[PDB]
Design a protein around this ligand. Sequence first.
Ligand SMILES: NC[C@H]1O[C@H](O[C@H]2[C@H](O)[C@@H](O[C@H]3O[C@H](CO)[C@@H](O)[C@H](N)[C@H]3O)[C@H](N)C[C@@H]2N)[C@H](O)[C@@H](O)[C@@H]1O
Ligand SMILES: NC[C@H]1O[C@H](O[C@H]2[C@H](O)[C@@H](O[C@H]3O[C@H](CO)[C@@H](O)[C@H](N)[C@H]3O)[C@H](N)C[C@@H]2N)[C@H](O)[C@@H](O)[C@@H]1O
Ligand SMILES: Nc1ncnc2c1ncn2[C@@H]1O[C@H](COP(=O)(O)CP(=O)(O)OP(=O)(O)O)[C@@H](O)[C@H]1O
Ligand SMILES: Nc1ncnc2c1ncn2[C@@H]1O[C@H](COP(=O)(O)CP(=O)(O)OP(=O)(O)O)[C@@H](O)[C@H]1O
Ligand SMILES: [Mg+2]
Ligand SMILES: [Mg+2]
Lengths: 253, 253
Amino acid sequence: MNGPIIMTREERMKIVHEIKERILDKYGDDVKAIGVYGSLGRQTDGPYSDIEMMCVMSTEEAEFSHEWTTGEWKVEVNFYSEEILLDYASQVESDWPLTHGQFFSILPIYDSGGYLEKVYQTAKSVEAQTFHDAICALIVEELFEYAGKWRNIRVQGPTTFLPSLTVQVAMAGAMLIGLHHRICYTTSASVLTEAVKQSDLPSGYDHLCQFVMSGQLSDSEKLLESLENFWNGIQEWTERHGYIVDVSKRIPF
Amino acid sequence: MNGPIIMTREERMKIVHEIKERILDKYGDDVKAIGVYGSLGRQTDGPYSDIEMMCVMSTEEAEFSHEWTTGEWKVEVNFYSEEILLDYASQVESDWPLTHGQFFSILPIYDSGGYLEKVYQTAKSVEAQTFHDAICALIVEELFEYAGKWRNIRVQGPTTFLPSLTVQVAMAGAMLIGLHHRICYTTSASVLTEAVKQSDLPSGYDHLCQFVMSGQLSDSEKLLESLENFWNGIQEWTERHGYIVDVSKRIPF
Ligand SMILES: NC[C@H]1O[C@H](O[C@H]2[C@H](O)[C@@H](O[C@H]3O[C@H](CO)[C@@H](O)[C@H](N)[C@H]3O)[C@H](N)C[C@@H]2N)[C@H](O)[C@@H](O)[C@@H]1O
Ligand SMILES: NC[C@H]1O[C@H](O[C@H]2[C@H](O)[C@@H](O[C@H]3O[C@H](CO)[C@@H](O)[C@H](N)[C@H]3O)[C@H](N)C[C@@H]2N)[C@H](O)[C@@H](O)[C@@H]1O
Ligand SMILES: Nc1ncnc2c1ncn2[C@@H]1O[C@H](COP(=O)(O)CP(=O)(O)OP(=O)(O)O)[C@@H](O)[C@H]1O
Ligand SMILES: Nc1ncnc2c1ncn2[C@@H]1O[C@H](COP(=O)(O)CP(=O)(O)OP(=O)(O)O)[C@@H](O)[C@H]1O
Ligand SMILES: [Mg+2]
Ligand SMILES: [Mg+2]
């Protein structure tokens, strides 16, 4: 295929409406509400942008999505039960700052009873603890691991992975930041640029983002240290912020 | 937190057994099989490598875990009811090649009745169609998606995401090859190197990987330009292999 074509918000929107009409002809009374999320729902959609949408079903245990292309453009429509969506909107995870911005950006197209605010609010009312736990997990389950792989790279190679790991790591810290600050990033592309602006940034972070953002990830000696510094900027940050991981137990269970 | 320290197979293996015991004292007869995977499992383990285990159980409602650190080390145990896991062994996703290697790389430490083979038989007893659909989905849900992005980037930005995007693309096309060649990667760091060793490469990938593996991601113009070609490489390749998706319908449902 020729890939994604240039379109206009106006064109995009007609599609939105076309699809909306189809959802209702098909499900009818089973449809509770329909929304536009992403760049479009934000009204910041670019020329090559896609259309993501989310639909709220009456129908229980409902969880499906329909994603397609016409060669020229692509669409994605997710359908959920009113429950399934709420629960989901209530989940803070390692990529929450990436995933959950979708709940504060909905562009309502059809609501039979304010389902869309409900959603938003729910997303909006997350307990602080939840975010803490999520930072903690992210460290054990993620940062730690990368730490290992990068220390082995030094040791036994390969550095052909170094450029890719760094990015992963650059990202990881950003989710770290966001979970900390209860922020969701605009898009996936604004992630680095927005993370590097926040306040209580771990020592070594910005410097790493430098590398990752400039594209100069060719010198593995340097990249090695940054990761190193960052990790240390982290051990600290955690202490001072209270996200202290339980190391104690050799056998957690 | 000192982060992963230097270990040896002996050390590792020592914990594995200790772990092996808690599980046995802890779940006893509900434990059908305990095994080891990862770098350890193959014994390709390194100084700073981690521990991955997996245990099968008779319990119906089984699908839980335990990941932890002590400050210098990480362990990761996965519990599953044989049904669930088997089921998962035969699940081909866009990332099956990164992921499914686990089902092959097993190091059996305990097994009441060859469950660890069933799982292996199962993982390798997956249908070509299944992989055929995997490919189609990637392209749409992903490839096509990355295409607009790098496009929009060419027109509005931002370049600070170019590097990172490119890595994403490279990973994915790699997924493509594996799914193409019922291949699985040993590990994460070997993905690329290994992938580019394949035959039927889509026109463009190799070059593209060279930038990612090298870290010479500073050149914008040169990237987008190496990405587009890749895209076109795809367009051809799929037509050659028959990874063809029907784009006739504007609204396919
Ligand atoms: N063996 C597979 C890996 O599975 C889990 O890892 C974590 C996932 O990766 C996380 O996902 C995050 O990181 C991904 C890249 O890994 C990104 O794509 C994603 N956007 C991020 O949110 C997810 N949220 C939690 C989960 N614990 C294990 O814990 C880890 O030990 C292991 O290595
Ligand atoms: N907006 C989020 C995206 O959600 C789905 O996309 C897909 C996920 O992204 C995939 O995950 C891949 O990307 C991860 C992150 O890099 C990698 O860790 C992983 N190895 C990859 O397989 C997953 N396997 C299938 C799923 N359909 C939508 O289809 C797509 O429209 C949208 O863009
Ligand atoms: N795994 C995931 N990755 C990225 N975004 C995710 C996501 N889970 C949820 N989201 C949300 O869903 C949206 C997905 O749209 P994307 O296709 O990633 C690009 P976009 O940010 O909408 O802008 P664009 O269309 O102009 O490129 C994100 O903006 C984000 O709010
Ligand atoms: N997202 C994912 N990333 C990496 N491996 C994944 C994975 N999902 C499943 N796996 C599988 O589970 C294993 C866990 O791998 P990791 O813990 O990330 C490092 P490793 O491949 O064991 O080598 P290493 O520890 O010496 O660096 C992998 O070898 C892979 O086969
Ligand atoms: Mg979008
Ligand atoms: Mg490992």
